[PDB]
C-alpha cells in the first residue's frame, strides 16, 4: 500500500507515535516519506547484503531477520517480512524499540538528512487529525 500523507499521519497518531519520546508526529511522517516514499512494500538491498524493509526501511542486519542476512542481530525479534504489511503495526512497534533504545530518530538516515532541523510540523498540517 502507498499511503497518502494525511492518511499515514492519521494511522501513526493512532499508534501513539505522536510525541513518543517527545517526537512530534511530523517527524515520523517526514521520515517515512524520504525513507520509503510511503510505500509499505519498499525494500532496498544494500552492499553488505542486508536489506531495508517497509514504510520505515528497517535494516535486516540489526533489527529484523529475513533469513538471508548473515549475522542478523534481529533486535526487534521479528521477521522482516512482517514489516511489508499494509498494516504499519509491526513497523511502528519495532520503530518504537529503536527509538526508546536510546538511538533517537537519528537511527533513520533519511530523517537526519531531510527532517531534522526543519519545520517538521508542516508534514501534518492540513490533515484531518
Amino acid at each position: 500500500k502507498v499511503f497518502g500523507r494525511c492518511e499515514l499521519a492519521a494511522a501513526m497518531k493512532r499508534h501513539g507515535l505522536d510525541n513518543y519520546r517527545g517526537y512530534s508526529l511530523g517527524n515520523w511522517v517526514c521520515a517515512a516519506k524520504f525513507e520509503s516514499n510511503f510505500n509499505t512494500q519498499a525494500t532496498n538491498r544494500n552492499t553488505d547484503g542486508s536489506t531495508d524493509y517497509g514504510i520505515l526501511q528497517i535494516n535486516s542486519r540489526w533489527w529484523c531477520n529475513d533469513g538471508r542476512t548473515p549475522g542478523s542481530r534481529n533486535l526487534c525479534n521479528i521477521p522482516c517480512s512482517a514489516l511489508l504489511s499494509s498494516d504499519i503495526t509491526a513497523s511502528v512497534n519495532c520503530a518504537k524499540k529503536i527509538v526508546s533504545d536510546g538511538n533517537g530518530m537519528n537511527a533513520w538516515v533519511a530523517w537526519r538528512n531531510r527532517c531534522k532541523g526543519t519545520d517538521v510540523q508542516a508534514w501534518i498540517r492540513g490533515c484531518r487529525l
Partner: nanobody
Amino acid sequence: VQLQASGGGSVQAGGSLRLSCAASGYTIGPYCMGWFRQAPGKEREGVAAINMGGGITYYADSVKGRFTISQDNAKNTVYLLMNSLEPEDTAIYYCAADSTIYASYYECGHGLSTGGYGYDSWGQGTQVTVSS
C-alpha cells in the same frame, strides 16, 4: 564504553605499521569504527572506517591503496594496516566508534569524511612518526 588502541611508534619512510583498536563495554555495536588523524598545522582528517559486521570499508583519498582496515571475527576489534608510509603520514592517530544502531542502512564513511559526525566515542590518540 571504552576504546583501547595500540600499535604505532616510529618507522622509516616506506615501512609499514599496524594499529589496532578494541571497543570494550558494548552490549550492541558499535555500528562504526574508524580512524582519524591529526598532524601539526593540518585539519583533522578521517582516514578509514568500516561498518561493523557488514564489513564494508571507506578510505580517505590520501590513503586509498596504501591503508587497509579490517574487523577481527566480529570480536569488536579492528586493525589498520599502513603500507608505503610517507613522512606526510606523520600524525596522531585516533580510533573512533559510532554507537548508534541505525534503522536504515548507513554508510560509516559518510560521517568519517564530514567532521566525524556520529562518532561519539574516542580513544587515546597514538603517535605515529615516519622518518626519512
